[PDB]
Each structure stands twice: as C-alpha cells, then as structure tokens.
Amino acid sequence: HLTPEEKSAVTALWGKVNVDEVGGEALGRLLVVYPWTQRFFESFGDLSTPDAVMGNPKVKAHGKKVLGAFSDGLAHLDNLKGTFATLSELHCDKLHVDPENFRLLGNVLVCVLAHHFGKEFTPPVQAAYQKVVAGVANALAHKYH
Amino acid sequence: HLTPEEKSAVTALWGKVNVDEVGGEALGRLLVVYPWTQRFFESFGDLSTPDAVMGNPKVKAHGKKVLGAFSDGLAHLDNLKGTFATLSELHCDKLHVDPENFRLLGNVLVCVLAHHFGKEFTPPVQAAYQKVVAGVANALAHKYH
Amino acid sequence: LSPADKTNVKAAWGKVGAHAGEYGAEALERMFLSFPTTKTYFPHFDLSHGSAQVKGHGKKVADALTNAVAHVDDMPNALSALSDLHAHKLRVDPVNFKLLSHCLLVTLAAHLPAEFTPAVHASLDKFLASVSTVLTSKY
Amino acid sequence: LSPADKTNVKAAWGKVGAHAGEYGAEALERMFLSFPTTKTYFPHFDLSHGSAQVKGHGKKVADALTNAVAHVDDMPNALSALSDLHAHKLRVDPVNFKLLSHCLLVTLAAHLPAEFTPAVHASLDKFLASVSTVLTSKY
Ligand code: HEM
Ligand code: HEM
Ligand code: HEM
Ligand code: HEM
After folding, report:
1. DSSP label at residue C77
2. Contact residues on chain A for C132, CB-CB shorter than 8 A
3. Which regions of D2-139 does DSSP assign to beta strands (E)?
4. Which residue in chain C has the smallest CA separation from A93?
5. How distant is the Cα of A29 from the closest Cα of chain D, in angstroms?
6. How many CB pairs under 8 A join B and C?
7. Which ligand has an atom closest to residue A65 CA?
C-alpha cells in the first residue's frame, strides 16, 4: 500500500543502510528492551547484560540474516505474503513466536533507522517504513491467520 | 480451520442460542468491561451504569444485528473473508475501529456462551468457538491488512 | 481497582469455594486446548485430559489466586516470588497471561451462571488484569 | 522501574532540554502520519504540517512528560487529572498510547543519536509505558 514516492524514499534510504550492523543492532535492542524474547535465543550465549547482548557474535550474525530477509522483502513489496512463506512456517510451526513480536522487531528497526539517519528520517520516510514493517510482520504471521 | 467434529459441535451449540438476547448481552458486556468502546456508541443514549447499558434498547437491537452477522459467518465458515468484506469496509474506513476490539468482542461472546450453556460448553467446544471468533475477527480486520 | 470491584471479586471467589483447584485445572486445560502455543512452556508435563500434573499445577495457580484475593491491596508484595519466577526464570510472553485470564473467566462463567453478572464480570476481568501486570512487572 | 532507569530517563529528558515542545509536536505529527486512525481524536484540529494547534498540543504533552520525569516516584498522583481526561472524557483506545510512545521514542532517537544507547532506549521505553498505564487506569 505504498505510493511511488514512498517506494522511492524507502529505496533511497535503504541504499545507505549498513547491512553488516543494522540487523544486529535491531535484534540486540529487541533482546534488551523486550527481555522475554531472550527465551528464543538461549543458545546464543550470555545475554544477561545489554553490553553482553550487543557484543554477542551470534546475535550479530542472526541480525545479519534478519536484515537480509528484510532487504529481500523490500525488493518485492507487492509479494510480501509469498516472499515470507517459508520464514512464516519456520517461525510459526516450529518456534511458536507470538506474532506481536514481529511488530515489536519492526518498531525496533524503525527506531534504529531513526537513530542512524537523524534528520534524514523525516516523518514521511518513517510512515513509509512503518507501512513496510507492518506488511512484513503481517506476511510473516500468515500461518497464524 | 475446523474439523468436521468441531463444525458439528459448533452448529449444534448455535441452534440452542437465542437470536434475540445473546448478541445484546455480548455488546452490553463489551461496553461494560471495556468502557473505551462506548466512544463508538454515543448516539445510543445512556451508558453510564452497567444497568443502563444492559437496559438499552439500542444496545439490544445492535447486538441482534451483530449476532446475525456472526450467524451468517458461521454458515460460511470457508468464506469468512468474502462474507465480511462490506462490514470490514464499514468498520475500518468509516468508523476506524481498532482490530483489537474485534477479538475483545469475540472473547466476550465466548464468555456469554459459556455463561449461558454451563457444563455443556466443554473445552473442546470452547476451542472450536475460539477458532470461529478468531476467523471472524481476522475477516473483519482484513481491510487493515 | 475500586472497592466495589474488590467486594465483587471477594464474593465471587468465596462462592468459588473449595473447587479452586478443579477450576484452575479446567482453566489450564481450556488454555491448552484453545491456544496450543501456550503448551510449549510445559515441555516435561503430561498435558492430556485428567492429568495429575495439570491437576497439581491448577491447584497451585488457584491457591496463588486465592492469596491474591486475600491481598488485593498488597498484590506486588504478595506475588513477588511468582513475578520473579515468571519474568526471569520462565520468560513468559505477556500475551499468554491475557490468554489464561480469558480461560479463567470462561471457567468461572461456565461454573457460576448466577454470579456472572456484567458487573462481576468486569470486576473479575480487572482483577485478573492486575494480577497479570504484577506477574509481568519485573520486565 | 529501577534507579538506573530513573537516572537514564532523567539524563535523556534533561538533555532534551528546551526543545521538548518541538519534540512533542514532531512526535504528534509522526503519529498522525504513521497511524492516521489517531487523527479521529482531533476532529476540530488543523492537523497540517507546521500547524500552531499541533505545536501547542505538542508543547502541552512535552510539559506533561517533563512533570512526569520530575515526579517519577509519584506519577499516578501527578497524572491523576490527565488520566481522568484520557479515560472518561476522551475515551482513548489504549493502543494509541503505545503508538504515541513509539513515535516519541523515534523522535528521541532521531534527535539524540549519541544518547540513544540500548540501555537508555530500554529505560525510556519503560518510562513511556509507565506514563501510558497511569493514563489508562481510570476506565
Ligand atoms: C519480524 C521480522 C523477522 C524476520 C524478517 C526474521 C527473519 C529470520 C531469518 C532470516 C531467520 C533465519 C532462518 C534460517 O537461517 O534458517 C530467522 C530465524 C529465527 N528467528 Fe526470526 N525474523 C523475524 C522476527 C523474529 C522474532 C521477533 C523472533 C523472536 C522473538 C524471531 C526468532 C527467530 C529464531 C529463534 C530463529 C532461529 C530459528 C532457526 O534458524 O531454525 N524472529 N528469522
Ligand atoms: C467483532 C465482530 C463484529 C461484528 C460481526 C459486527 C457487526 C456489525 C453489523 C452487522 C453492523 C450493522 C451494519 C449496518 O447495519 O449496516 C455493525 C455496525 C457497527 N459496528 Fe460492528 N461488529 C463487530 C464489532 C464491532 C466493535 C468491536 C465495535 C466497536 C468497538 C463495532 C462498532 C460498530 C458501530 C459503531 C456500528 C454502527 C455503524 C452502522 O450502524 O452502520 N463493531 N457491526
Ligand atoms: C493468573 C496467572 C498465573 C498464576 C496465578 C500463576 C501461578 C503459578 C504458580 C503458583 C506456579 C508454581 C510456583 C511454585 O511452584 O513455586 C507457577 C509456575 C509456572 N507457571 Fe504460572 N501462573 C500464571 C500464569 C502463567 C502463564 C500464562 C503461563 C504460561 C503460558 C505460566 C507458566 C508457568 C510455568 C511453566 C510454571 C512452571 C511449572 C513447572 O515447570 O512445573 N504461568 N505459576
Ligand atoms: C504519553 C502520552 C500522552 C500524554 C502525556 C498526553 C498529554 C495530554 C495533555 C497535557 C493534554 C492537555 C490537557 C489539558 O489541556 O487540560 C492532552 C489532551 C488530549 N489528548 Fe493526550 N496525552 C497522551 C496521549 C494521548 C493519545 C495517544 C491520544 C490520542 C490518540 C490523546 C488524545 C488527546 C486529546 C484528543 C486531547 C484533547 C486536546 C484538546 O481538546 O485540545 N492523548 N493530552
């Protein structure tokens, strides 16, 4: 449900996103701010301190994978439901992740983008990205529907 | 999805349900338990006390309409998305009702059915009706998707 | 939580009586049947119908709720160990507390038809909501 | 909350400084753009960009948040009048409070990049959620 202007703004801002650290930051901040989500990552090592979470190589690598999935969803904005079918089955039929955590992660990603880009992250850019992350969460929660 | 046994149980419990009092009780109980939902029914008159809510003819008739919509959805369990398209447009574009209130009302209806049917409202029957009301809420919130 | 709400909850839970453990077991069974994703928090449990482990856990939950009714004005202090357990050791998603509250309300409605007036329904709903916030307050 | 949370929130809001009204107006504009269903609560408002009405409302919200920061240990008493207005007269759906809290956090992240560490982020999330619970405790 993105206008061409919204799609262009989203693409332009995503072009400057560091794909090596943004996903790790988003996932680590999710773990710190919503600590019940740490239940799903018990094999990631020590997550007791925010510094330990943000310094965790496994958290960084998984954030890289999640950011790659987000970029894949951004490349196909008109087929999010079909892009995230396998990931939806993995998250729902195997991990039992509540779909509200998808929205939580999307909002954490929006906060990380704001923290990185500052005044470049204008309210219209944020609105376009909110549409994007809401669509991604809805597509990822399709098995629950 | 509902198995044939769950569908049979749901239909059997539905025939017993009164079509003139259950929906009004569910709408009234929603208005009492979640009083921010009264913001959508300002033209319904006095709603200050629970007795005033449950004695409201407008609340009774509107609950009758909602129960009829639920019955229509039950007769078309495999086409919930197409059954509630016009109602979804009415609730989202015209009234801006948050989709959380749909699940709230479905849960209040489940509580009303339990209160009316007692020991006959077994946990399997409740699970089938939870699937039914979740499907109805998802169909009514589809226009936000 | 208003004093009328406290009176309503106290009357309803007193009328529940000695069936508290049975009601807790039924609420847990309803939660497991309606929302099977909540079953993952009990991996070592035998979660079949009539299970002794489910019966004992339902008794424990019912005694906790009876204590909370006895301590409405002191819920954070009365439920401190339970809140620590649920928030730190178990890391229960806060949505499952809503699910269990709904199943408890359904059990109460099904077993106490006369007591489940709309006012009692609202009072019990907000009592269970407050119990859930206390149990999730250590996040 | 926590003493460390209180210190983090106090530091972040103090370094917000005299721009708090601008921050609140920007957060309200972000909420109106991202979640247009929130605009139904302001039907007699001019909700265009650069609107003086939104500027004044953002200033009011920012002053309320500054008062809440100053009275972190007595927030329910400091925010009693506001909680009555939000729940009885306005009847704001409690999801909108989460929406406004998210937009406030986004404004803070965009304007204080150096201070938006994960720990400060968690502290601010806890603070804003506590303000939202205080404002939604009078239904
Ligand atoms: C909201 C958007 C999300 C996206 C796009 C996403 C994406 C991904 C990706 C790409 C993988 C890699 C799977 C593989 O390598 O085979 C994965 C796995 C995983 N995700 Fe997510 N994720 C999201 C949200 C979440 C949330 C919120 C949680 C937990 C609270 C979560 C928990 C997990 C876990 C535990 C795995 C490991 C499972 C496995 O690899 O077998 N995910 N996700
Ligand atoms: C969850 C299942 C629901 C169903 C099946 C349902 C069904 C209906 C029906 C059949 C109508 C009548 C429309 C007409 O006469 O043209 C209606 C109207 C309305 N509904 Fe719902 N409803 C649901 C939930 C809700 C909730 C939770 C709210 C508010 C919190 C709400 C607010 C309204 C309002 C304000 C109207 C008046 C609009 C009109 O009469 O045209 N509905 N709904
Ligand atoms: C009103 C809500 C709740 C109450 C009063 C409650 C109460 C209790 C009590 C009394 C115990 C045992 C404590 C002990 O043995 O020392 C317990 C343990 C436990 N609770 Fe809850 N609880 C509630 C909600 C939940 C929910 C919603 C879940 C999960 C969806 C949950 C999962 C557990 C688990 C996994 C245990 C550990 C039991 C075991 O491993 O043997 N609780 N709870
Ligand atoms: C942290 C959250 C919030 C704070 C601190 C806050 C604060 C305030 C303040 C200080 C006022 C002015 C009261 C007065 O002038 O006497 C107000 C009014 C109002 N608020 Fe909020 N508010 C919050 C959340 C919300 C949300 C989420 C909504 C709607 C989505 C909302 C809708 C309104 C409305 C409609 C008014 C009336 C304004 C007018 O009539 O001029 N508030 N709020």
Report:
1. H
2. none
3. none
4. C37
5. 6
6. 59
7. 1
- Chain B positions touching D94 (Cβ under 8 A) are 36
- By C-alpha distance, which of B31, B5, B107 is closest to C31? B107
In this complex, which of B28, B118, B124 lies closest to C110 when CB atoms are compared?
Answer: B118
Among candidates B130, A85, A141, B108, which has minimal Cα distance to C36? B130
Q: Please provide the distance, in angstroms rounded to a whole number, between the alpha carbons at the two ends of chain B.
A: 20
Give me the amino acid identity at C91.
R
Enter the resolution in angstroms: 2.5
Question: Which residues of chain D lie closer than 8 angstroms to B38, CB-CB?
Answer: 91
CB half-sphere exposure, B4, CA atoms < 13 A: 0
Return all residues near D6 (Cβ < 8 A) that are at least 6 apart: D72, D123
Nearest residue by C-alpha to atom 43 in ligand 2: B66
Fold classification of C1-139 (topology level): Globin-like (1.10.490)
* Chain B nearest C-alpha distance from D39 (Å): 10
Interface contact D106, partner B, CB < 8 A: no
A92: Cβ contacts below 8 Å, ≥ 6 apart: A141, A143, A144
Q: Cβ atoms within 10 A of the Cβ of B57, count?
A: 10
| Residue in this structure with the two tokens 């991202």, named with its chain if needed | D34
Put simply, whether C92 touches A (Cβ < 8 Å) is yes
Query: Mutate which of B110, B112, B115 to test chain C, going by most C C-beta atoms within 10 A?
Result: B115
Distances (CA, A) of B89 to A142, B72, B85, B93, B139: 21, 17, 6, 5, 11
Give the closest-approach CA distance of B64 to chain C in angstroms: 18
What are B30's two structure tokens? Answer: 């929603």
CB B97 within 8 A of CB B36: no
CB-based contacts of D14, cutoff 8 Å, min separation 6: none
Beta carbons within 8 Å of A99's beta carbon, 6+ residues apart: A137, A140, A141, A144
3-state secondary structure of C51: coil
| Structural tokens at position D136 | 């939604």
Among B32, B53, B107, whose Cβ lies nearest the Cβ of C102? B107
Give the domains, in start order, of chain B with CATH numbers.
1-145 (1.10.490.10)
d(CA A61, CA C11): 55
- What method did the depositors use to determine the structure? cryo-EM
SS3 state of residue A60 = helix
**Ligand closest to CA B140:** 2
CA A34 from chain centre, in angstroms, equals 14
For chain C, percent helix, then strand, then coil, each to nearest 5? 80, 0, 20
